[PDB]
Amino acid sequence: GKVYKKVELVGTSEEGLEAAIQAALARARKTLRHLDWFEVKEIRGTIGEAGVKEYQVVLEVGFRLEET
Amino acid sequence: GKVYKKVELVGTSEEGLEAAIQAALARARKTLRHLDWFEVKEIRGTIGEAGVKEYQVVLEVGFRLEE
Amino acid sequence: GKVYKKVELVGTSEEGLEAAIQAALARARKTLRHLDWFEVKEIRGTIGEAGVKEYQVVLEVGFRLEE
Amino acid sequence: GKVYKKVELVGTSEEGLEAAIQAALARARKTLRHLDWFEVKEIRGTIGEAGVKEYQVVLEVGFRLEE
Amino acid sequence: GKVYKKVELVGTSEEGLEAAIQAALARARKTLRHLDWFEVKEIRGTIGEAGVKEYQVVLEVGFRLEET
Amino acid sequence: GKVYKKVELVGTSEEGLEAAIQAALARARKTLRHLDWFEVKEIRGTIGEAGVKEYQVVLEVGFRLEE
Amino acid sequence: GKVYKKVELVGTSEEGLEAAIQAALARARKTLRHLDWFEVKEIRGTIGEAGVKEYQVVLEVGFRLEET
Amino acid sequence: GKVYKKVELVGTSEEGLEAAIQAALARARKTLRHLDWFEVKEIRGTIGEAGVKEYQVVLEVGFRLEET
Amino acid sequence: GKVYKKVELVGTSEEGLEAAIQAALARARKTLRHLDWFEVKEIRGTIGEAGVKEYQVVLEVGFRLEE
Amino acid sequence: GKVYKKVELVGTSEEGLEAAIQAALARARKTLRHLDWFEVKEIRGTIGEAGVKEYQVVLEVGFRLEE
Amino acid sequence: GKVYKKVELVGTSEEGLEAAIQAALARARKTLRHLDWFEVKEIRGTIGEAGVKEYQVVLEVGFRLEE
Amino acid sequence: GKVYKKVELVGTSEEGLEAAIQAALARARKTLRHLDWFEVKEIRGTIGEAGVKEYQVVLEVGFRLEE
Ligand SMILES: [Cl-]
Ligand SMILES: [Cl-]
Ligand SMILES: [Cl-]
Ligand SMILES: [Cl-]
Ligand code: NA
Ligand code: NA
């Protein structure tokens, strides 16, 4: 029947976790069609003088493949 | 001694991770007594036109059992 | 030497596990060349009134990269 | 707002994997409402004179909770 | 064929691992029928002035379900 | 009390999962005594022109050791 | 070449995940030098009358070691 | 240099964990030479009317292989 | 808020599992303050002529940090 | 902020581990831009008459995506 | 169809990783026939005054079972 | 009675895996006494113009504690 594909991305953001996630999805939408779900694999980040510099969320984005 | 039980729930929310966790805890409080701790197992979600449709957090809720 | 690539697909089917795997592989053949092997990562599915609605097999497909 | 609950069951059958899964779902449908999805956690079984005696599929059944 | 259900419990005890396990099983038999097997998932505990305060054993208890 | 041993085998087959499992158990029966249970660890396979060429199921076979 | 060390901390906060993480990092910078990155290992918490009492984020903090 | 081999065994005992472990080692000593170490993989068991019927410890036994 | 630290120790003992855990906690108490909880990660050991030479339990010890 | 993508490759070589890794990176450089980091997931290989025939290293290559 | 067996070995060497793997495989050749592949499970070692004393590679060796 | 402690380090080197491990052990020897063993947890690295820029090996170093 239907077949999906999953790509692994790493969204980053200085705002927070949800922001990093949306950042990855926003870019995914530019080149991938039929985005359906995502799964968080890792949550990490860089440290600056004020604490967290950047949040980095590693996630898998699942999307439906078309006919051909 | 004391004995606890753990149940696995998946709280959802279009707002955020904390909201999804709270949603699951809110519902848990209605039928389970002595809620003590939770452990997040998975974080996933669905995608819509604006990006994240709903955040889904799989978590285990531990509570103390009576008698 | 030789270098391979692995892509993650999710084949579905209402018939069974083998069918879901085949579905994923059939679509893979359309856009990928030199498909060599697959590894099943997860087996899950949706539930309907008759039980299993659709079986969903998450798998990795390995194929030889050209050049 | 929505909240789901997952329970772990072990379906068994002498027929095969799919049958063992259906067996667990069939029994689940008797006491649980709004069955949505299932995840296979382990596949094991017992051995008899003719090979596989009984297939045993440990799976999680997710279902939606009423507010 | 037969169907089983597994529940996750945490048995505790100041005496030891075996005691913690038994404590969990003892309570399990008061509300669950047809207990067949258990599986240890975690072993943790709290620390007191004399070392271990209480042992905590997270385990899954498997029991057969009645077709009703 | 009693003691068991577990060996890891990989059964293969062009027909399906159950068949690959059976193939491993069939061969295990020829040199091992008191076979009791099995656990599936991995499910993988090779790809051919028609899709799945061979299904490969890695499993652990548990058997009682004699004293 | 360079060598790094990782320490495991648990930051807590009644506000949220990002806050818990920052709390851990804030304390980390008082005794550790050259903090470079962090990795979330677990997310758990305690439950109170209003739901989440406190969020607990277990994380690893990586920092560069000084050759001395 | 040296090469070791690991076999997986399941020791059982009604006494307790340590007992099940020793049970597996005792039998291992009968047919395997140069036993060096063991690693516990799983701890499970059966349930009887008095609680735990049998403890079952799944472990790997490592031993040194000889010349030929 | 409060911040904890976790250290990983491997307590040993020729007596048993509980003893090995205690051995690690005893030593921990000498240089670490505010010990709160422990988590067992691994259970292994060495083998001698009488069977188990020494039990080794890898565990993490969590304690609250000051200021 | 920025977004990265990770692809899974398997580099192979008859000489060793580093060589297999390099082989994967060499090929990755031909079609992927902004390669930043890699992570080794698995190390396996084939066996021949002289021992190791080919070393196979499965790794993830992370690279920055352009906007 | 064909059935394979996997045994777990631990090769050691003071020279390096590849050497430890080869050591395990060389001894394997002495008593096992039809060695086909290996999978590295762990990489550990002992420490001496000069740093690494011996590298120890835990691996699984797959081979075709006869008949 | 004996108690060990494990610390997690990340050794780096542009030479190779073994070198990165030695780098971590070398630095470890400067502040830690009774280094006994090490376990490799991850192998990763950075990518440069020529392929691997720097190998990074995350490992745990076990050492014996003084009573
Ligand atoms: Cl791709
Ligand atoms: Cl329940
Ligand atoms: Cl430290
Ligand atoms: Cl054997
Ligand atoms: Na948040
Ligand atoms: Na004990």
PDB file of C-alpha atoms in Angstrom, chain E residues 18, chain F residues 1-4, chain H residues 9-28 38 40 42-45 52 54-59 61, chain I residues 17 52 55:
ATOM      1  CA  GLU E  18      14.682 -10.519  46.660  1.00  0.00           C
TER       2      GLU E  18
ATOM      3  CA  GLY F   1      18.185 -25.879  39.948  1.00  0.00           C
ATOM      4  CA  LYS F   2      18.044 -26.415  36.169  1.00  0.00           C
ATOM      5  CA  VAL F   3      20.240 -24.577  33.717  1.00  0.00           C
ATOM      6  CA  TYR F   4      19.558 -23.590  30.141  1.00  0.00           C
TER       7      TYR F   4
ATOM      8  CA  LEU H   9      23.188 -19.405  30.071  1.00  0.00           C
ATOM      9  CA  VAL H  10      20.128 -19.183  32.253  1.00  0.00           C
ATOM     10  CA  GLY H  11      20.680 -20.250  35.844  1.00  0.00           C
ATOM     11  CA  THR H  12      17.598 -20.954  37.952  1.00  0.00           C
ATOM     12  CA  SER H  13      17.091 -21.306  41.711  1.00  0.00           C
ATOM     13  CA  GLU H  14      14.307 -21.042  44.289  1.00  0.00           C
ATOM     14  CA  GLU H  15      16.736 -19.541  46.798  1.00  0.00           C
ATOM     15  CA  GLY H  16      17.623 -16.263  45.121  1.00  0.00           C
ATOM     16  CA  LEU H  17      19.635 -14.289  42.564  1.00  0.00           C
ATOM     17  CA  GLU H  18      23.123 -15.226  43.731  1.00  0.00           C
ATOM     18  CA  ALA H  19      21.993 -18.861  43.895  1.00  0.00           C
ATOM     19  CA  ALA H  20      20.728 -18.875  40.286  1.00  0.00           C
ATOM     20  CA  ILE H  21      24.016 -17.317  39.188  1.00  0.00           C
ATOM     21  CA  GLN H  22      26.135 -19.920  41.014  1.00  0.00           C
ATOM     22  CA  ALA H  23      23.846 -22.656  39.589  1.00  0.00           C
ATOM     23  CA  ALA H  24      24.712 -21.561  36.049  1.00  0.00           C
ATOM     24  CA  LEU H  25      28.428 -21.333  36.853  1.00  0.00           C
ATOM     25  CA  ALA H  26      28.496 -24.732  38.498  1.00  0.00           C
ATOM     26  CA  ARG H  27      27.120 -26.364  35.369  1.00  0.00           C
ATOM     27  CA  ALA H  28      29.382 -24.275  33.156  1.00  0.00           C
ATOM     28  CA  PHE H  38      30.147 -13.331  33.748  1.00  0.00           C
ATOM     29  CA  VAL H  40      24.038 -10.557  33.918  1.00  0.00           C
ATOM     30  CA  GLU H  42      18.268 -10.396  32.448  1.00  0.00           C
ATOM     31  CA  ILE H  43      16.661 -11.205  35.759  1.00  0.00           C
ATOM     32  CA  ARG H  44      13.251 -12.833  35.550  1.00  0.00           C
ATOM     33  CA  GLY H  45      11.338 -15.694  37.161  1.00  0.00           C
ATOM     34  CA  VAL H  52       8.536 -16.163  43.483  1.00  0.00           C
ATOM     35  CA  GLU H  54      11.989 -19.673  40.607  1.00  0.00           C
ATOM     36  CA  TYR H  55      14.516 -16.978  39.968  1.00  0.00           C
ATOM     37  CA  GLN H  56      15.965 -17.090  36.541  1.00  0.00           C
ATOM     38  CA  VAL H  57      19.125 -15.195  35.768  1.00  0.00           C
ATOM     39  CA  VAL H  58      20.225 -14.888  32.132  1.00  0.00           C
ATOM     40  CA  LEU H  59      23.950 -14.308  31.928  1.00  0.00           C
ATOM     41  CA  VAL H  61      29.935 -16.553  30.773  1.00  0.00           C
TER      42      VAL H  61
ATOM     43  CA  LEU I  17      24.802  -8.114  45.138  1.00  0.00           C
ATOM     44  CA  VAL I  52      31.676 -16.521  41.683  1.00  0.00           C
ATOM     45  CA  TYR I  55      30.281  -9.728  42.349  1.00  0.00           C
TER      46      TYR I  55
END
